[PDB]
Amino acid sequence: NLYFQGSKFSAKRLPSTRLGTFLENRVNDFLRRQNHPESGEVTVRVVHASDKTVEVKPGMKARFVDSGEMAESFPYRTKALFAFEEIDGVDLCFFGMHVQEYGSDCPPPNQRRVYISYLDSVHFFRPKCLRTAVYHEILIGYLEYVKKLGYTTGHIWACPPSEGDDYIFHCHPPDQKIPKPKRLQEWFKKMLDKAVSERIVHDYKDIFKQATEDRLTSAKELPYFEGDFWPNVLEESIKESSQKLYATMEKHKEVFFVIRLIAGPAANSLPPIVDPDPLIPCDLMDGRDAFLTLARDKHLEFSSLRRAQWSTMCMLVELHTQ
Ligand SMILES: CC(C)(COP(=O)(O)OP(=O)(O)OC[C@H]1O[C@@H](n2cnc3c(N)ncnc32)[C@H](O)[C@@H]1OP(=O)(O)O)[C@@H](O)C(=O)NCCC(=O)NCCS
Ligand SMILES: Cc1[nH]c2ccccc2c1-c1ncc(C(F)(F)F)cc1Cl
């Protein structure tokens, strides 16, 4: 075999991580209990991990940071992970997700939280009848894994991409339907209800219920995440001027899930979060832009199985080499 088409550049030979091994073990265990003949071995790899900070934007800084009520910035670790399936000997990249992990050495209100910035997929998983179930196993495992390290809360924003935009994979298949907000909200509910039944998630609530239950009064109590809706909405509210906050939360409450992983009394005694995986510098996978940019420029579409496999191979070579 030619050098770049050799096994050295396969998904499997990408460096292993504790998180990657955990997710894939869980996915392949679910797959072996199904005993479906056309399914292939799944590989999950964390391909980027780096320390970042999210600084509070000027309006909120003015109101809350200079007055001493709120830290000016929050440290977090961003991770990029991808799921691959071998389809009769060929690696296919079918799912990806970037997350933001705010640890125990982080000020409130962001302490011990994970945020799913971006998630995306391409619908060639074989067999197609286990596709949704596998996406759910990955998400559930992610939540279980971070619970076990000592993250207490998770945060999901269910916004589908506007028509024609791609979140991670350049050029989806034209026959891959994009769900409307309702269908996506239900999809997340189904996943979370399964996580709840496994006693991974204690419970979840939309942001309006949660705020009510928390008797939240100030905007400084909201988690402040990189690239999220809510920091832009507050800069919008400040530049032009609790009545307007709750009103805005109620309005978008279906779209934002607060996921409680560790509950009440247990969440105060927690030891410090120790992440046993290393940092993994990889500029290609530092947020979603770099990979969209490369794939646009080099014409690496994910728009058919065969384009997706070529695109996957180029992706892999690049991760192995940078
Ligand atoms: C989120 C995502 C992984 C869900 O994939 P999934 O498990 O296949 O579930 P979907 O809701 O997309 O599809 C399930 C079914 O609903 C159908 N469906 C999806 N959108 C539809 C629409 N607008 N109208 C009718 N049917 C639709 C699909 O065709 C599919 O039918 P099938 O099961 O018979 O094949 C995928 O839709 C996706 O990658 N979306 C873009 C990324 C994203 O939305 N991220 C948001 C959070 S950051
Ligand atoms: C800011 C933000 N960004 C999000 C992104 C995804 C999911 C949830 C949130 C939230 C949120 N989290 C907690 C509360 C609450 F607990 F205070 F109610 C309120 C809010 Cl709006």
Numbering used by the authors: 1280 to 1520, 1581 to 1661
Authors' text:
To improve homogeneity, a construct omitting the autoacetylation-prone autoinhibitory loop was inactivated through mutation of residue Y1467 to F: p300‐HAT‐YF‐Δloop [K1287‐Q1663/Y1467F/Δ(L1520‐L1580)] and overexpressed in E. coli. Ternary crystals of p300‐HAT‐YF‐Δloop with CoA and CPI-090 were obtained at 4° C from 200 + 150 nl sitting drops with a 60 μL reservoir consisting of 0.1 M CHES pH 9.5 and 30% w/v PEG 3000 [MCSG1 (MCSG) (purchased from Anatrace), condition A2]. Followup with dynamic scanning fluorimetry (DSF) of the P300-HAT domain indicated strong stabilization, especially for CPI-090. Despite their chemical differences, these new allosteric compounds bind in the same location, ∼8 Å distant from the active site, between the α5 and α6 helices. Essentially, the allosteric compounds displace water molecules. However, derivatization failed to improve the compound activity from this starting point (data not shown). Derivatization yielded actionable SAR and improvement in the biochemical activity (data not shown), and so this series was selected for cell-based assays.
P300 is an ∼2400AA multidomain protein whose catalytic core consists of bromo-, RING, PHD, and histone acetyltransferase (HAT) domains. It can also acetylate itself, as well as other proteins, and recruit a larger complex of proteins including transcription factors. The overall structure is as expected from previous p300-HAT structures: a central β-sheet is composed of seven β-strands and surrounded by nine α-helices.
